[PDB]
Amino acid sequence: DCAKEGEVCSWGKKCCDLDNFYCPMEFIPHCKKYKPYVPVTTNCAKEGEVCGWGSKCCHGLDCPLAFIPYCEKYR
């Protein structure tokens, strides 16, 4: 009774097994495959650089929360 990947969920039938198909929310949703879990690629902001305005902070450093936030290693 499932709704296949690409078919309309959230009205008639829900999506199939959650290895692949999430719904999503956008009011006429279509069961979409997940993307691959990719890490922080290029154009990142390194440690001591400004995060939160231009670029994300990289994988091993938080931004974390300031007005002009600089990346930092964990304690």
Partner: protein, 394 residues
Amino acid sequence: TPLALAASSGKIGVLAYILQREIHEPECRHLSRKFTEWAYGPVHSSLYDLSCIDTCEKNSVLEVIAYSSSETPNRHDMLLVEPLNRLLQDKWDRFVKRIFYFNFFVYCLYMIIFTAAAYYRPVEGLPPYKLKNTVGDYFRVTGEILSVSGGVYFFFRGIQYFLQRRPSLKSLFVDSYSEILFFVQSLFMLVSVVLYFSQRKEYVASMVFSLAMGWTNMLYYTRGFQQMGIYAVMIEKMILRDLCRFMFVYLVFLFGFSTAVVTLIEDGKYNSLYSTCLELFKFTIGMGDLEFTENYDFKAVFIILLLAYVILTYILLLNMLIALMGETVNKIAQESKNIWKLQRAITILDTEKSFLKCMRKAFRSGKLLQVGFTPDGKDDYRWCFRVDEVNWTT
């Protein structure tokens, strides 16, 4: 007629003149409308005349004042004229009150059948269901057949309302609000009856809106009682005046910032315009989470918008809406005792037209020849409906 044209235009003093004239003079007593039989202070029992006040042949003075489409701003001629503030009370307490609670009982009985025929729906399968011989299986197919039959009834009685009195051109909602919500309830169920035999599983989505709306339409019947009638009136004005005019002010903030948030950050929870308009509706409703945990490019800009959103639509706009709703609540509760009587007159006039055969109950208080003669003849006939008053002259 000049009497109906005074009623169809909101003229109390012209209409209070015609209903309470007492022209005591030879060759002028027959011209009068009120005949005071006797007076014994402060009691003054006076026999009136019901020539075009209740006589449902032509446009009677009651069918005109009730069906007047929210203009003619001198409404509530009921308690302001009063040979008919007691005609309505006579029709209510004798004939209409018993048939009103019967209608409210059947509608409660209809909704219990319909809320139970939906609570026990079969889950598996999408096609129209054929049930086997079960004591509970046969008793619910009767329950579903009765439920659609109600949705047929409110459909045809709703079209009958629109054809009989043709409301149009932004008078469908101001007057005739509560008659179209029964019509929308009916056509959610007829769409549900189409999608059921169309073998679509999405029939229950239409039936559920027919069931939530069916219970909220049960406070149609609160409208008409003295105490609990104010709640159904101010839930109408807050939707039609307050929330409808406000939802274009709010929606330009919602669509304004949600198109801003989507182009700012492209990640989960805000990738689409629809999911962003829901998360920004949750912030102005108060039920949102300002957790700025996850890392975005343009995270620090995102905090400045989302705080300038929350301070601007949860503090300003939401409390501005509550302040405007609070004015129309306290305005409509001061004028409560006035606002009550017109809804009963709309119900008392409707229930009299529903039978259309019990003309013995349609007349009020007997025929009486109280003129004694005419300007030319010596015989007369009138429908009196006396009423005893208590006013004081010192």
